[PDB]
Amino acid sequence: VETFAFQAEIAQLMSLIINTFYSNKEIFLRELISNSSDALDKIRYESLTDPSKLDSGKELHINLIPNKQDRTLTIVDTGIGMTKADLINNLGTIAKSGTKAFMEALQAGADISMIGQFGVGFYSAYLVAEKVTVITKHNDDEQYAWESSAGGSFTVRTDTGEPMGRGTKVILHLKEDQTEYLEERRIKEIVKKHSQFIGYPITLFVE
Numbered sequence: 001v002e003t004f005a006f007q008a009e010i011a012q013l014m015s016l017i018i019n020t021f022y023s024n025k026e027i028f029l030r031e032l033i034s035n036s037s038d039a040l041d042k043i044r045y046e047s048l049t050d051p052s053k054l055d056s057g058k059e060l061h062i063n064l065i066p067n068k069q070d071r072t073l074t075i076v077d078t079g080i081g082m083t084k085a086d087l088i089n090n091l092g093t094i095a096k097s098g099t100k101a102f103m104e105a106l107q108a109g110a111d112i113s114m115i116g117q118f119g120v121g122f123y124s125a126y127l128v129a130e131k132v133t134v135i136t137k138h139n140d141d142e143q144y145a146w147e148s149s150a151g152g153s154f155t156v157r158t159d160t161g162e163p164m165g166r167g168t169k170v171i172l173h174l175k176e177d178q179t180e181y182l183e184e185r186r187i188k189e190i191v192k193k194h195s196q197f198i199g200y201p202i203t204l205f206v207e
């Protein structure tokens with residue numbers, strides 16, 4: 001297991017997300033679904049010229065899996081996946097510059113719900129999760145697990161878990177007071193409200 005420090009700007013963003021009073025926490029799901037859609041777009045585009053890129057799975061979709069026993073909500077996609085280098089490099093985002101721009105915008109009056117416009121929507125997961133685990137598999141690289149409970153560091157290790165084929169799984173270990181996001185009707189409501197027109201099937205698992 002390798003442990004890394006977040007860049008200062010990202011630690012700052014995470015602390016702000018965790019410590020700022022903001023009731024509209026449901027936006028985290030929209031941001032993660034949006035990220036999954038973008039990753040699915042990427043593998044779709046690559047497959048247009050190299051159909052064999054889909055050898056690792058032809059179906060392009062998103063699964064939402066609540067687990068009340070583990071107090072987790074997991075968002076799974078079969079998108080392009082990330083390399084180890086991507087994970088370390090702020091999970092394939094331009095988080096350093098994006099954070100700067102998000103900050104500049106917040107000063108220009110913007111609110112936290114606009115976070116996705118700056119390429120750092122992922123970190124909104126920390127509105128509802130005490131810990132986030134990201135499992136990912138990119139074609140021709142191994143499966144890796146990233147994990148962080150904030151506090152300035154993250155870990156990366158090779159994943160010995162269930163082989164994914166290709167794509168990304170975001171596991172949200174929810175805060176004790178955020179278990180509404182495991183309720184079927186609540187997830188349905190959020191998806192219908194914020195993600196009604198995503199171009200890939202979204203399947204909400206039941207328990």
Ligand SMILES: CC(C)c1cc(-c2cc(N)on2)c(O)cc1O
Pocket residue numbers: 032035036039040077079080081082086091092093122134167168170
């Ligand atoms: C963790 C977060 C930023 C995120 C990244 C990817 C992703 C990005 C790439 N290149 O591959 N997979 C994704 O599918 C979903 C996500 O919520």
